[PDB]
């Protein structure tokens, strides 16, 4: 029970431990097969785990075994500050003295009188402590942080001259702003009406004026076939007369293009794809030599031409032109020949009917003139692509004039009503495909709807060749007419069911059209848009006018934005997501300092010695 | 009746060369076949997706391994990214010999391949395992090509928020193969787990991520760890092993903590709900940072009776052990949890993930089992009993019993003998004495009437070290000797890195040199043809640790117990010019509350390299196609091909 | 680091009693002297801090001065008005890094 | 020689469902006498099941903490005079959830529980001086 009258090592003599990095040796360097780099150990007593990665051009990646560097001081001072300290609140510091030496030490511990902190004695008052060998002695220090931002408090423990050992630690305690932390989550919605919205500026009274005001935006995108066996079996080598060759070539081209568009070529072996291409090339040549002088494409050279088969061949060859190095001018001549056969009112003649009507599909019947007129226009339109961009300008304009005349004529016939399902179906597709006038297009669409049939789920219009073909034409019209809406999905489902039967698509006219419709439907359904939802926020705050953007083409995004007042929103894009701006600020919060559930009270009675007193 | 045979890994990664194998079969010996192989997508009118490569294989040297380049620009031009129904590209071989001589319908023969933009390896490293809000995060990403050499491609690094919200995206083109960047966590960030993702710019699904945890922590001063006496507790009827565990508290710098340990016990179900005990709390002073705490059998069951759980109910429950050590007279406390300590009915746990299915009649079915101690490292000297019951259709099912001990690495190779014309097989393997850990499986025999099978036999049955040369014995089974050669190939990381042939002999032995190209594992597909049909049988071969060739050796000046501020000398030894990327970490951070996830090491690197492997299973197959599929190969000999994979994973 | 000291001898008195340090960054580290009289334990007699702030044992404070100079890496404990109880063996004390303590052979002094 | 009296009670009915671990810290320069501390655990109605004291630190484990003001006291010894006057600290934890702490500052017999700090509505200043 005795003091020391300044018989302790000098305060300035002991080094001060102030650098406490949780991670220090962060660097990437080049080594010439050998290198020693000196390091300056940070003033923290732990076991560093030094590790490295070697990235050489020749050898490659080669991770290394960690080196457990251990830094330790025999007599030190461990000052552990709390994570959060509130200003103007009693604080308890317990810097413990660890004496691992084999001697007993009497030391003086005192907190340097850093400004902004009020010590127990108001200054550097020493607290003698006896630390026995291999023991820890806490030295409590009660302080009240009166500062505003942060204070660097250093605890100095200078030992006696019996064994001159000392250590000092300097740390900075972060005093958080007065008041609690509040979160204001403002959820919203987004859409392509209801586009622009404005989030009201904060006007709460509890907010402390002088302090922090952080706002964060969190936008979320919130995003939501026919058997390859049967279709492949349709690939057959064309043979026979000028008509029977097209019987075997039209299905072959449709099956090849269906799989091409449906991307079902992977299922079959690659040999089949080139086998299909080779058959198309052979068929293209086989029918090309049946061509007359003026591109008539008759069944026999001696026999007179038929406009029906010429249009059918023109449609088939025009589609195959993409994958076959054909000669466009021959198709141009054929289109020119077709224009000649047009009647005064815009119809088409077909002076010589084809030998076999079984390939005509649902054409044989009471009504033929309207079917041919629409059928030829579909073929004629398909021939627009083959026309070369350079030269042959007059030929095109003559086609658009005639097809428009045919489009007009179809308008009166369809509008007249009492047309058969097949004639109505083709007429609707012809007008929609060729960009017919809206009024005629509109009536044709609703006329077909009237003749529509519905017997159950995924039922519309086993089945006869007429019904299968007519449904296919309607499906093509619906898909091109304001997209697909709950009917192409339902209608096409029947076509797949009807085509899945053994030996389905009995005829060829249905087979080519049906496979054309289903391929168009499949590509329409399996397609996605950008779904962009980029939103821009703008506000006129104290700092002025600021703007931001958040592209959500793919995920979710968060972004720091410096807007302190009422903000504006500018949503764009078809995609709909969720926007929620959260603002954080300090409020005037108060509570019990005392314990609420578990309470402990301790009192001391007796006489306690002292050295310096007021 | 010759054949041209096309081999290629079942998946082609855009931007990296693709290994293709072309091999003739039954050639008249007087004709040389020439052609070219290329990728083409039939969805876009057979537009080639890669430059054509010609092989020109002859009869004297039929086998020919050739590589195809697949640049990104070529893929874009041919329209591989515009596909709608999944990724699918065709690899074809164009050779006029097919149509003119063999009289095939078309001079083309190919295989359907899946494709993916995944390529290269990205390794992300963070400053610290765990951060607290307001601190600056320093992360760097290493870009590596397929061959593990440094790359210089453009990458994009996007940091994700705890909720999955991106808060950063930096498209950086990098010539040094190392890209160091940092950011600041928001001061208001709630505790959670973040994620740093990086990917090559051109590639779209070639990403790689490293997770760091954000949590409000104060760096602990000492570490507490609870080590149970045995990681398992027997719960068999009658006998209940005593539950004793040790508690150790040690200051980070190494000295032993001197405090008091307060322990509480409880049970956990599968989800994690806790059922704490009452009155079983044990508090004891730590002598030299040690406290041996055990539960007597009498008091444990009493607590169970108090909770009416019952002995039988201890099916998969975990016995919680939480400490609250308080160093005295320090005043601070740290806590340890012991979630991973189960009640089990047997100490050992057999693993039969290496025993190949699809036995081959007439050859010794090799049984491979890994006897791993319950939640622990593999153990040695544990007798394992197997009772194989071959089910002969024409007689009573014979029963064979054979016993062997673990070699010492935890793996046991027990060869059982299987006769011909066997319907199926059922064998039960049980390692333990007493308390066996029974495990059983049934392997069905291949359909009868097919071509003779191929039996791949490895005499050693141990994982070879890099630089060794393992020998494999090939033997045809139940077939004529019409064939005159054995064709084999080696697959590593989804690439045919070796193709050759071996002449038939009485004892056909093939020496395979295991270099760094074959790591951490490789397949071995060998096939022979019985006139017209193919016969094949694969074999997955593992490889040892095979430390990096780079040979980076961090070292310090011994152990001098450096004081704070002393100048240490870090010695860096490397076998060539290299970019050493260093990081010194405070081990106290690992103690601070966290998942204690492992850092980057060879376990992750070898997993990265082997992440590209396409094969699945231990090998073997019912038919030639199935074994080619299993090994991760696409095959087509004209009249018999392999269907495209349904997915990038098996 | 090796500490070398000398200059102690019988006197009626004043002794230079200088000590030299074997380099090792003599400056920027505290230095001083220790008195070890017969029987009793070793005690501080006088010391000089790195900054120059001198401290003396209260028992013999203010009698004999302590001088440290960096020119030749040495210290002095010039004595004066020697008291008969001062007979003891002195040691040269060095104190580097704040935790490392060193002491020399120690020269003995006699009084009459 | 000084006499201590540490007391514990809880409001209860929620939040605790367990026992407590007192962590009273003695005044600087004290150390609880071992003898008086041991006799607490020897009584038939012993209030604390386990204890451990080293230097100025005392770790008392209270098996049961009731809603009443039941409590125990011990004696300390003086080994070195307290250099400066300040209020020490005492902490009570929850056995099954030590996060539920309870920090209380206790002063010397003739001193106060808080440092002299004259605080206004917005700013405060301290009068720690002679
Ligand atoms: C330190 O004090 C203890 C108290 O009993 C004593 O046993 C020990 O001998 C002392 N140290 C030395 C070096 O004498
Ligand atoms: C997104 O930005 C683009 C321009 O890049 C523009 O379309 C519009 O401003 C936003 N909305 C959509 C849907 O793109
Ligand atoms: C603290 O909580 C108690 C309830 O036990 C209440 O009586 C007291 O008023 C609270 N202190 C305040 C509101 O300052
Ligand atoms: C890449 O991202 C996808 C989806 O964003 C994810 O499923 C995948 O796991 C990521 N890759 C890695 C290696 O984590």
Author numbering:
A (entry chain B): 759 to 950, 954 to 985, 994 to 1230, 1256 to 1348, 1354 to 1413
B (entry chain A): 20 to 669
C (entry chain D): 2 to 13, 16 to 115
D (entry chain C): 1465 to 1594
Excerpt from the publication:
The structures rationalize the observed functional effects of the nanobodies and define their mode of action during complement activation.
Cleavage of the mammalian plasma protein C4 into C4b initiates opsonization, lysis, and clearance of microbes and damaged host cells by the classical and lectin pathways of the complement system. C4 is cleaved into a small fragment, C4a, and a large fragment, C4b, that act as an opsonin. C4b is covalently linked to the targeted surface through a reaction of its reactive thioester moiety with available nucleophiles on the surface. Subsequently, C4b binds protease C2 and forms proconvertase C4b2 that is further processed into C4b2b, which is the (CP and LP) C3 convertase that cleaves C3 (15).
